[PDB]
């Protein structure tokens, strides 16, 4: 019988309970977005990697949900390698940042994908 660690097990939502995605698996996820017609986009954060509540504590309000956009949503992107290239460039510029790939759906003005692609040292 093992005890689940109360520390050093911070998560980043979808897929974060699985072993770190290999470049090949990371690439397969991006192809799922493209196959469905979803517009890929990258987001990164350097300071607050997890949600907190500093400005308000009313129901539904949390700070730290929004991260900063890396460039622009990749409309018309057909090659999943173009997306993977940006992740390399992003962590090159900000190695101490968390980076995630999000997907947008148009029939619905919604976001429908969000998984971590890179985590800083000790995370």
């Amino acid at each position: 019988m093992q005890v689940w660690p109360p520390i050093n097990k911070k998560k980043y939502e979808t897929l974060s309970y699985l072993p770190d995605l290999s470049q090949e698996q990371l690439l397969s996820e991006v192809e799922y977005l493209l196959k469905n017609g979803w517009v890929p986009c990258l987001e990164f954060e350097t300071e607050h990697g997890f949600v907190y509540r500093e400005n308000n504590k009313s129901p539904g309000y949390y700070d730290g949900r929004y991260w900063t956009m890396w460039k622009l949503p990749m409309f018309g992107c057909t090659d999943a390698t173009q997306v993977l290239a940006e992740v390399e460039e992003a962590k090159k510029a900000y190695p101490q940042a968390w980076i995630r790939i999000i997907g947008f759906d148009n029939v619905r003005q919604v976001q429908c994908i969000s998984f971590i692609a890179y985590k800083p040292e000790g995370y």
């Binding site: 093992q2 689940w4 939502e13 698996q25 129901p59």
Partner: protein
């Protein structure tokens, strides 16, 4: 009283503003279908055996329900489907209470019928616009919670009734810290000698905030606000708002539509998500010959208001029953659902942008059911576990971890192009390699399905 010559109108062309009803009629022997269907329409509108002077001070043909079509049921004999049309004016705007009173108020007790069952209702866009609907709905909810690309996960705190406020909170923290998004107050748990509501709300808030701080993910606990009076119900929601928690809960059928609409309005105005439990539904929707099918009770909830609604389980069901379930699941989530008798959808339903409701799947769900559930329901669903978390050998947290890992393994496999239908068991097998928690939860299952075990390297 010969209704047939006044209420049975096969030449009637339904209007865009009419409320349509599909009744499954089982008339008494000797009573013709046309007369039975006319009795159904008559009783649920003007209800007149003959004529009184007051009927001349208005136009009877303006407020009457009309049976415009009859269809014999393929299977059993003596069973017909009667289609009735009701004028938009018969109904009070924004009141599900009035809609149910007019349509199902007296007809089920008519003597000429042996049994009666309301199968579906076509809610026209003009009536839909008079309702607020879900406080938030699927999209806004995912945005508030910042959760995308996978079904949400919840678990029930057991036993149903019996635990104290602090022990309740302890189980809440352990489950949530392990990977689950939500924990649930039992539908029976309101305020009792063993645990008063305010103490529960207080300890559960402490527990959910700790798990959120520990994991970095937004957590929620359905705090049951169901109560004896409207005032108590609101008083309970007000405290949830003061604590700053994200979601409250209500038993809409035992609490009632009038009280539920009030809570839903309150939740919209105060940013609270509303989880709905369907307690008591089976006394109304189980028998195929008499009652109201769940798809109508689900439509009523979406109009009255709720962000989540329990919609049973698909595990161990014949396609058949499974198709009926997917039928009402679409009616709850989608904006436009086209007519399809194969899935029990008697009418095309246009929801005119009314927010969709997140279906909650619960009932004997285990980790090895994850592949089938993820495939059948898709991402927009909440999968709830009871003994799959609490019954895990190592406890709540490891039990929550097992379910979270199992779900993510299914999502990853699906995204990679794998067929969850035929590779389901294998997907869970591979996952057991990298998760001691998942492995321990799959022991008895491995012995039967794979005749072993183990790992290798």
């Amino acid at each position: 009283k010969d209704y047939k010559l006044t209420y049975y109108t096969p030449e009637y062309q339904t209007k865009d503003t009419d409320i349509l009803a599909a009744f499954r009629v089982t008339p008494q022997p000797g009573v013709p279908p046309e007369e039975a269907g006319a009795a159904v329409a008559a009783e649920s509108s003007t209800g007149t055996w003959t004529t009184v002077w007051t009927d001349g001070l208005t136009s009877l043909d303006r407020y009457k329900g009309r049976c415009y079509r009859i269809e014999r049921v393929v299977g059993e004999k003596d069973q017909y489907i009667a289609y009735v049309a009701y004028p938009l004016d018969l109904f009070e705007e924004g009141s599900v209470t009035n809609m149910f009173t007019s349509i199902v108020g007296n007809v089920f007790g008519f003597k000429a019928l042996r049994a009666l069952r309301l199968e579906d209702l076509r809610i026209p866009p003009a009536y839909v616009k008079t309702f607020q609907g879900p406080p938030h709905g699927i999209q806004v909810e995912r945005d508030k919670l910042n959760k995308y690309g996978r079904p949400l996960l919840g678990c029930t705190i057991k036993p149903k009734l019996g635990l104290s406020a602090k022990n309740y909170g302890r189980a809440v923290y352990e489950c949530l810290r392990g990977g689950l998004d939500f924990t649930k107050d039992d539908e029976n748990v309101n305020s009792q000698p063993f645990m008063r509501w305010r103490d529960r709300f207080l300890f559960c808030a402490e527990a959910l905030y700790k798990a959120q701080a520990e994991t970095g993910e937004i957590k929620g606990h359905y705090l049951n606000a169901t109560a004896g009076t409207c005032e108590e119900m609101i008083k309970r929601a007000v405290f949830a708002r003061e604590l700053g928690v994200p979601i409250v809960m209500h038993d809409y059928l035992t609490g009632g539509f009038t009280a539920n609409t009030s809570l839903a309005h309150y939740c919209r105005d105060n940013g609270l998500l509303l989880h709905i439990h369907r307690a008591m539904h089976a006394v109304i929707d189980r028998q195929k010959n008499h009652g109201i099918h769940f798809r109508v009770l689900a439509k009523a909830l979406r109009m009255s208001g709720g962000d989540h609604i329990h919609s049973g389980t698909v595990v161990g069901k014949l396609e058949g029953e499974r198709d009926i379930t997917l039928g009402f699941v679409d009616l709850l989530r989608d904006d436009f659902v086209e007519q399809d008798r194969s899935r029990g959808i008697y009418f095309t339903q246009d929801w005119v942008s009314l927010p969709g409701v997140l279906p909650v799947a619960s009932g004997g769900i285990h980790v090895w059911h994850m592949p089938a559930l993820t495939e059948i329901f898709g991402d927009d669903s909440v999968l709830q576990f009871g003994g799959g978390t609490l019954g895990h050998p190592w406890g709540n947290a490891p039990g929550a971890v097992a379910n979270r890992v199992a779900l993510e393994a299914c999502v990853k496999a699906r995204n990679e192009g794998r067929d969850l239908a035929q590779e389901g068991n294998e997907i869970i097998r591979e996952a057991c390699k990298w998760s001691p928690e998942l492995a321990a939860a799959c022991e008895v299952w491995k012995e039967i399905v794979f005749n072993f075990a183990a790992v290798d390297v």
